[PDB]
Scaffold this active site. Structure first.
Site, PDB file in Angstrom:
ATOM      1  N   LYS A  34      27.123  89.407  59.858  1.00 34.17           N
ATOM      2  CA  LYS A  34      27.533  90.657  60.518  1.00 34.17           C
ATOM      3  C   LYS A  34      26.373  91.613  60.476  1.00 34.17           C
ATOM      4  O   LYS A  34      25.903  91.953  59.383  1.00 34.17           O
ATOM      5  CB  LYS A  34      28.775  91.265  59.887  1.00 34.17           C
ATOM      6  CG  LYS A  34      29.238  92.541  60.553  1.00 34.17           C
ATOM      7  CD  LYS A  34      30.563  93.016  60.009  1.00 34.17           C
ATOM      8  CE  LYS A  34      30.965  94.305  60.671  1.00 34.17           C
ATOM      9  NZ  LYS A  34      32.284  94.735  60.177  1.00 34.17           N
ATOM     10  N   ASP A 133      42.672  98.077  56.865  1.00 35.59           N
ATOM     11  CA  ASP A 133      42.542  97.766  58.303  1.00 35.59           C
ATOM     12  C   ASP A 133      42.991  96.317  58.520  1.00 35.59           C
ATOM     13  O   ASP A 133      42.346  95.548  59.235  1.00 35.59           O
ATOM     14  CB  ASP A 133      41.132  98.049  58.835  1.00 35.59           C
ATOM     15  CG  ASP A 133      41.027  98.044  60.348  1.00 35.59           C
ATOM     16  OD1 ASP A 133      42.036  98.205  61.020  1.00 35.59           O
ATOM     17  OD2 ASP A 133      39.891  97.902  60.791  1.00 35.59           O
TER      18      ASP A 133
HETATM   19  C1  LIG Z   1      36.500  89.855  61.188  1.00 33.80           C
HETATM   20  O1  LIG Z   1      35.358  90.183  60.363  1.00 33.80           O
HETATM   21  C2  LIG Z   1      34.376  89.215  60.201  1.00 33.80           C
HETATM   22  C3  LIG Z   1      34.438  87.934  60.698  1.00 33.80           C
HETATM   23  C4  LIG Z   1      33.454  86.991  60.467  1.00 33.80           C
HETATM   24  C5  LIG Z   1      33.574  85.620  61.026  1.00 33.80           C
HETATM   25  C6  LIG Z   1      33.474  84.579  60.137  1.00 33.80           C
HETATM   26  N1  LIG Z   1      33.568  83.291  60.524  1.00 33.80           N
HETATM   27  C7  LIG Z   1      33.726  83.036  61.841  1.00 33.80           C
HETATM   28  C8  LIG Z   1      33.786  84.014  62.835  1.00 33.80           C
HETATM   29  C9  LIG Z   1      33.969  83.525  64.292  1.00 33.80           C
HETATM   30  C10 LIG Z   1      33.303  82.365  64.587  1.00 33.80           C
HETATM   31  C11 LIG Z   1      33.480  81.830  65.888  1.00 33.80           C
HETATM   32  C12 LIG Z   1      34.276  82.485  66.774  1.00 33.80           C
HETATM   33  C13 LIG Z   1      34.517  81.953  68.178  1.00 33.80           C
HETATM   34  C14 LIG Z   1      33.220  81.586  68.905  1.00 33.80           C
HETATM   35  C15 LIG Z   1      33.320  80.299  69.746  1.00 33.80           C
HETATM   36  N2  LIG Z   1      34.638  80.142  70.395  1.00 33.80           N
HETATM   37  C16 LIG Z   1      34.726  80.971  71.630  1.00 33.80           C
HETATM   38  C17 LIG Z   1      35.828  80.332  69.538  1.00 33.80           C
HETATM   39  C18 LIG Z   1      35.445  80.753  68.117  1.00 33.80           C
HETATM   40  C19 LIG Z   1      34.932  83.618  66.471  1.00 33.80           C
HETATM   41  C20 LIG Z   1      34.786  84.178  65.152  1.00 33.80           C
HETATM   42  C21 LIG Z   1      33.695  85.354  62.401  1.00 33.80           C
HETATM   43  C22 LIG Z   1      33.680  86.529  63.357  1.00 33.80           C
HETATM   44  C23 LIG Z   1      32.386  87.362  59.712  1.00 33.80           C
HETATM   45  C24 LIG Z   1      32.313  88.684  59.230  1.00 33.80           C
HETATM   46  O2  LIG Z   1      31.231  89.150  58.475  1.00 33.80           O
HETATM   47  C25 LIG Z   1      30.115  88.279  58.308  1.00 33.80           C
HETATM   48  C26 LIG Z   1      33.281  89.629  59.481  1.00 33.80           C
HETATM   49  O3  LIG Z   1      33.179  90.910  59.026  1.00 33.80           O
HETATM   50  C27 LIG Z   1      33.463  91.082  57.675  1.00 33.80           C
END
Ligand SMILES: COc1cc(-c2cncc(-c3ccc(C4CCN(C)CC4)cc3)c2C)cc(OC)c1OC
Ligand SMILES: COc1cc(-c2cncc(-c3ccc(C4CCN(C)CC4)cc3)c2C)cc(OC)c1OC
Ligand SMILES: COc1cc(-c2cncc(-c3ccc(C4CCN(C)CC4)cc3)c2C)cc(OC)c1OC
Length: 283
Positions: A34, A133
């Protein structure tokens, strides 16, 4: 010794006002990175201060790896590095997927488990923590069918929350701000909304609801504080329970549970530990 710090950013998996999240690579493993906007630096500081206080480790809490601050010519770069969950957010997943009884319960009990872990003070341990949140975009789906809770940038130990998920005492500004239990009860309200979002996607008798966010039928997109206060405080509306739930014992039990997270009186709401116990007795 060699300290191989370098993380390779590979693909952007989210962009917002908060900044961006990337899939990255470290030593051949995926990590989530992030990158914070200047606008949201306090969220990096708060999550970093919390993890410097207590190294949370729980299968239903997004796994911390690192907090990085890097000096740039004319700016400070702030990264939070965590475990990477390739299935993405629960919000994402529910658009895309229907659930059976086992998968619905496993999702909601895993969220309740992460939330109860945040909320409980352990002596010897951890301070009690309220999230502030909780929502389906802040929950990630794991390959084993459990979820984990993400984003402790607003958390408090013992930016405002997403307005759609705010409890009535937040919207009417009656919340007892000197009372840590007040913040737990705001998370329980939001949990009830999440439970409603998920339950809608559980099939019964060949029926399922389309994914909708809480209060989709009564407020606009990006609802204002006043829009939410009128619905939740003045009119005291709650999300609809469809008739078809009352033919299914699991959804009937979940409807009762979500009602007990939505009382106007914050002290009447169930605790995260009580929600867990109730979910272990369903099916
Ligand atoms: C909410 O907050 C945080 C989330 C994350 C996080 C951790 N693993 C995976 C994700 C992710 C991966 C892949 C997709 C999509 C992309 C491809 N396809 C279209 C479907 C799947 C979406 C989401 C995320 C966003 C990390 C964070 O911090 C490092 C966050 O903030 C604290
Ligand atoms: C600075 O920055 C980052 C560093 C790393 C990283 C890379 N190799 C090795 C390490 C390591 C861990 C732990 C020890 C311990 C060993 C036992 N001893 C008694 C105390 C010290 C030493 C070295 C780290 C922490 C990764 C990063 O990203 C994933 C970093 O950037 C955020
Ligand atoms: C930040 O993240 C990751 C870090 C590392 C990693 C790299 N070098 C060294 C270490 C290490 C070695 C030894 C000690 C301890 C063991 C004995 N004790 C009594 C005191 C000192 C601590 C730390 C680690 C943990 C690996 C990771 O993944 C494989 C990491 O995750 C991405």
């Amino acid at each position: 010794r060699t300290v191989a710090r370098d993380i390779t950013l590979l693909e952007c998996v989210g962009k917002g006002r908060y900044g961006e999240v990337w899939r990255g690579s470290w030593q051949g493993e995926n990590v989530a990175v992030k990158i914070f906007s200047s606008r949201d630096e306090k969220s990096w500081f708060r999550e970093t201060e919390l993890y410097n206080t207590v190294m949370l480790r729980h299968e239903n809490i997004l796994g911390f790896i690192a907090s990085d601050m890097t000096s740039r010519h004319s700016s400070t770069q702030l990264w939070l590095i965590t475990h990477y969950h390739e299935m993405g957010s629960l919000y994402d997943y529910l658009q895309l997927t229907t659930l059976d009884t086992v998968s619905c319960l496993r999702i909601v009990l895993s969220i309740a488990s992460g939330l109860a872990h945040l909320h409980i003070e352990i002596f010897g341990g951890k301070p009690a923590i309220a999230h502030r949140d909780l929502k389906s975009k802040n929950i990630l789906v794991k390959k084993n069918g459990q979820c984990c809770i993400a984003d402790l940038g607003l958390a408090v130990m013992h930016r405002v929350g997403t307005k759609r998920y705010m409890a009535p005492e937040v919207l009417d500004e009656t919340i007892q701000v000197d009372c840590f239990d007040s913040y737990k009860r705001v998370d329980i309200w939001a949990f009830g909304l999440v439970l409603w979002e998920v339950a809608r996607r559980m099939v019964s008798n060949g029926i399922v609801e389309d994914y909708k966010p809480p209060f989709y039928d009564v407020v606009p997109n990006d609802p204002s504080f006043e829009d939410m206060r009128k619905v939740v405080c003045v009119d005291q509306q709650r999300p609809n329970i469809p008739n078809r739930w009352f033919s299914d014992p699991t959804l009937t039990s979940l409807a009762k549970l979500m009602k007990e997270c939505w009382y106007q009186n914050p002290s009447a709401r169930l605790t995260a530990l009580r929600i867990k116990k109730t979910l272990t007795k369903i099916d």
